[PDB]
Amino acid sequence: EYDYLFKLLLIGDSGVGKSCLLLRFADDTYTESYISTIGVDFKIRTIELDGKTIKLQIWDTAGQERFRTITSSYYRGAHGIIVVYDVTDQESYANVKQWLQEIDRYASENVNKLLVGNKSDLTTKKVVDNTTAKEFADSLGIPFLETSAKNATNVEQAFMTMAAEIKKRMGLEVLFQ
């Protein structure tokens, strides 16, 4: 039984670590196998925030344009959407702008967003400055976070805070007209 049922969606360029992120959250495991997601997948994990029990229904999407038609059809029905980039991949960060566009286009007007830079454990190759990124996120009233799916760094937090921002919006919507 649960108090809340939130539906989340992960999006971002191919190979940035979406699936690796979701697996870490749901199964606490990490595989190094080079597998690429077809279309969409989903895992489920129940958390409790503020004494309230929240069910998370999380869907992974495929980053390749050749799958967009299939993935896009999953936006509108989402409470929150985590956009992911690779801190070692400059182009994936530059694509975040376009990814945010796809949200305005398929997603509900008042859907919760969240910016994530993954692979933070790769200190040597990191190429996207955190600072530069918190700015952009701030410029949009969006939360930000750097995760490593390999290590569990900030992973549980990312999903936790997307969950938190939803309960907050869910609550304001019940309150005001």
Place this chain on the structure above:
Amino acid sequence: KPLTLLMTSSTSFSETINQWADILKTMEKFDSNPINLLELVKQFNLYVDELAITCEANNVWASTPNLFALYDNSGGEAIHGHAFVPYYKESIVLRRLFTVDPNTFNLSRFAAFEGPCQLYCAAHADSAWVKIQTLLTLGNGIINTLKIIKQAQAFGIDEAVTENLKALKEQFIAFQLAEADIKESLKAPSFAEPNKESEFFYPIDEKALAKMNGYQLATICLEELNSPKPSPLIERILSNKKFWKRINSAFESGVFKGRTDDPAGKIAKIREWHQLLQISG
């Protein structure tokens, strides 16, 4: 009032779709649980392979770097286990790009072509490659939708077992329209037409080969072990002493670890073969 989708009034992906399209063309009642997606994966993969053979035979792709050669921004770096080699045959890239893994129902990564191909698509919308992508992508999709549907149902998500299922069917139609467009194009005539050196790459001259770096060369050697018998191309690469430092270096980088095609076994073999060929050049 069970309706799981029925397997054999077809044993080939294209027809087996429409025994299914057929009866989703024909309602209320559904255990997807009994459905053989895995068998569906076995068929689709043949569909892909057979469609690839056909393309290479009809000369449909028309040095001879391949179609995607001018769009490589990889800097010769290895992208998730694969480096870009401009001498891959288009029909192998095809295969690598759309064949579904039976153990995960996802794709094995062929990352170095993921971007150059998209770019190529954006610049040749009328191309055959696109029409083929459109088709095989829908094949991947159908597969996926079935996977989802099974577990959605299996999990509850009445919303899920429903809204997809509308779509699963809807994909069937666009497939057909695809089969139709592709078909007409392969009906076209073609003059006759092979490379003794490799099953996978176009011919590579001495000059071209030496300009490859360790990741590119390693990638080629790993690709050649997909053939049941040692290939001339790999003997050429492994028998050259000047290449080895950078091939082994790339192996040690750890970049190929995640591959699904037993890189450990392949690499162990390659090192053995090189040891052998190092004697008597």
